[PDB]
Amino acid sequence: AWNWDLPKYIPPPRVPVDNPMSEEKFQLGRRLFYDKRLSGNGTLSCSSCHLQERAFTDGRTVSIGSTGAKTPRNAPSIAYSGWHGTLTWANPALVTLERQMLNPLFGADPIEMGASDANKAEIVARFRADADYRRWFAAAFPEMSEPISFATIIAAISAFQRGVYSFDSRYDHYLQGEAQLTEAEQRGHDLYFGEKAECHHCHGSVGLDDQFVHARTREPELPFHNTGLYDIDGKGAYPAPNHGLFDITGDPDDMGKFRAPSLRNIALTAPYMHDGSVATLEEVIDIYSEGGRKIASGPHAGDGRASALKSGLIVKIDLTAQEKADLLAFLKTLTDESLIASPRFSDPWR
Ligand code: HEC
Ligand code: HEC
Ligand SMILES: [Ca+2]
């Protein structure tokens, strides 16, 4: 029977009623997440792009799929993903990890894991060909005649992902009362939650996002935001291939709108932004201070501070070098102790 083991302030996540949590399901998912044999040609596991060492992200601006194509976007973290209202960077239709998983697995455009109908069965057989995997699926899905399929692979990995969290940060300790925040950290903190810096509007939930969804959430929030990273045409256009919410609705005023990412482990998940185009957290704050980014040079040139689509809440906010460092100091309190080195989420294959 699954113990959530949550702080007071985190309610349990919504679990799809036909895929209940269990420890057998968790460990199977962990083995499959890290197994290079789930990809079409056997070169990549999920963990290739979602490294533990980096809070389950890549360290690269974009990622490299199993046939060697680049992804159009930066690989976000999978930690805490059980609480995300909408999964990836800009898609209101992906609202379940089970559903989302089909993209990395079967998506071409571009190939990531590289599972097609041509190799579908071949992959599955690889797990039936294995002694240890037969125990696991069997022990995890006991009500099933044939318990190694793709519905079973998705269910397991989904369970694993819901088990990936540790509300372990200095910020979390602070909120529980086990820790005092630094003078710098307090001053960054008061900025973050103040109507000058404004970060709590979009990064101010206990998930440090504004799409926090648990198992009690009714009438969910779900907003998206243009933050003025670009204005390619002088009309607020973001460069192809990343239009954000526009790419799904076709509505012109959703151009450059993205989900606000959770800021948990932000210190560890650089590069930043939807396309990895901001190298450091110092440059991020520079950008918020100016109400947007100005690209002075080449193909991406334009000024996002002046974009028409930009959010109401991002204005020019002349923050002093002091206030910027205090705010940077506060973002560094959002890294987890456990997560990066816990045996629980480590590669089980060595
Ligand atoms: C070679 C690259 C690559 C592989 C392989 C890959 N991912 Fe991803 N992952 C991405 C990128 C890039 C995104 C961002 C997608 C987007 O919005 O365009 C992503 C997004 C996600 C998200 C949404 C997270 C959020 O915060 O909303 C989850 C969950 C996820 N991946 C899990 C998986 C699982 C499970 C596997 C394989 C079993 C997998 N990933 C394989 C690169 C990859
Ligand atoms: C009204 C919306 C809004 C406000 C205000 C806002 N953000 Fe964001 N933030 C976003 C969105 C949306 C993105 C993703 C944008 C993209 O990649 O195109 C983002 C991206 C980020 C990233 C990179 C995240 C990642 O996972 O790669 C950091 C760091 C960040 N914000 C911190 C801040 C700080 C610090 C403030 C204010 C002091 C702030 N934000 C104010 C919505 C906002
Ligand atoms: Ca990143």
Side-chain angles (χ1 to χ4, degrees):
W2 187 269
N3 286 302
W4 279 109
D5 173 49
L6 291 178
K8 291 191 299 160
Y9 53 86
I10 306 283
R14 174 265 171 182
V15 177
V17 88
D18 69 301
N19 190 19
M21 298 301 293
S22 70
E23 183 70 22
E24 308 80 69
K25 223 131 63 157
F26 179 87
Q27 300 294 169
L28 209 208
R30 189 184 148 213
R31 300 204 81 121
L32 292 156
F33 196 82
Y34 285 94
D35 203 335
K36 285 144 63 226
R37 149 198 330 160
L38 186 56
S39 61
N41 62 21
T43 68
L44 295 198
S45 54
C46 315
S47 71
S48 311
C49 301
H50 299 281
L51 287 166
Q52 191 184 25
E53 311 75 298
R54 291 175 161 299
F56 302 93
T57 64
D58 224 352
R60 312 176 299 215
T61 80
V62 298
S63 303
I64 296 168
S66 54
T67 58
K70 305 216 182 216
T71 54
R73 291 172 286 292
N74 184 251
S77 182
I78 66 96
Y80 308 95
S81 72
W83 288 280
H84 295 345
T86 75
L87 278 320
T88 53
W89 277 106
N91 190 339
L94 305 170
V95 305
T96 321
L97 301 156
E98 285 84 333
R99 178 55 197 87
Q100 188 278 336
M101 212 180 316
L102 306 169
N103 307 349
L105 290 166
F106 309 106
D109 174 42
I111 281 158
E112 294 175 46
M113 291 306 268
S116 59
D117 284 330
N119 58 41
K120 190 102 158 141
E122 197 212 311
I123 289 157
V124 177
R126 291 184 201 151
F127 299 100
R128 291 149 181 188
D130 196 302
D132 308 323
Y133 270 110
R134 313 221 317 283
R135 281 87 150 259
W136 304 323
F137 289 86
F141 301 89
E143 304 309 286
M144 285 192 75
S145 176
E146 182 53 82
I148 311 170
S149 75
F150 263 105
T152 327
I153 285 181
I154 283 153
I157 304 177
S158 279
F160 167 68
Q161 295 185 299
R162 304 192 166 90
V164 176
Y165 59 82
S166 44
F167 285 91
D168 223 32
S169 70
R170 174 171 204 66
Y171 179 59
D172 287 291
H173 294 321
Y174 161 76
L175 281 185
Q176 287 151 44
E178 176 145 295
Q180 186 69 359
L181 285 188
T182 260
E183 306 289 63
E185 292 161 6
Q186 204 68 225
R187 279 195 307 274
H189 170 98
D190 290 316
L191 262 172
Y192 194 100
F193 289 88
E195 287 296 333
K196 197 226 269 187
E198 295 273 43
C199 329
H200 65 276
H201 282 310
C202 306
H203 302 294
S205 74
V206 292
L208 290 305
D209 64 333
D210 55 355
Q211 297 191 175
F212 191 82
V213 181
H214 45 90
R216 290 164 227 187
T217 300
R218 280 100 155 248
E219 218 292 316
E221 38 266 325
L222 309 203
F224 300 82
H225 314 279
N226 180 298
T227 63
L229 296 151
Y230 297 102
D231 192 336
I232 310 288
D233 56 354
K235 319 297 285 182
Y238 272 32
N242 309 307
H243 309 313
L245 198 67
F246 175 75
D247 281 341
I248 274 139
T249 60
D251 184 335
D253 67 59
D254 295 343
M255 172 75 61
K257 291 184 188 253
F258 285 90
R259 178 203 46 186
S262 179
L263 295 178
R264 306 198 162 256
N265 301 295
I266 198 67
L268 309 183
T269 60
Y272 314 106
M273 311 320 271
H274 80 270
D275 59 344
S277 66
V278 183
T280 85
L281 285 163
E282 292 89 322
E283 324 173 31
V284 173
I285 299 154
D286 280 351
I287 295 159
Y288 284 102
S289 146
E290 269 127 19
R293 186 158 72 162
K294 199 195 94 199
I295 300 89
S297 49
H300 291 311
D303 209 293
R305 284 153 6 189
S307 163
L309 286 328
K310 191 183 80 170
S311 173
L313 299 155
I314 286 152
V315 290
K316 212 190 85 49
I317 284 302
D318 218 82
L319 296 178
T320 83
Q322 174 86 310
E323 301 183 307
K324 286 180 182 150
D326 301 316
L327 194 87
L328 178 68
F330 177 68
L331 294 179
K332 301 201 168 132
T333 68
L334 303 167
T335 313
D336 288 319
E337 303 194 329
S338 159
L339 190 88
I340 313 304
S342 179
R344 191 147 171 89
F345 323 118
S346 60
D347 194 337
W349 300 103
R350 288 199 138 206

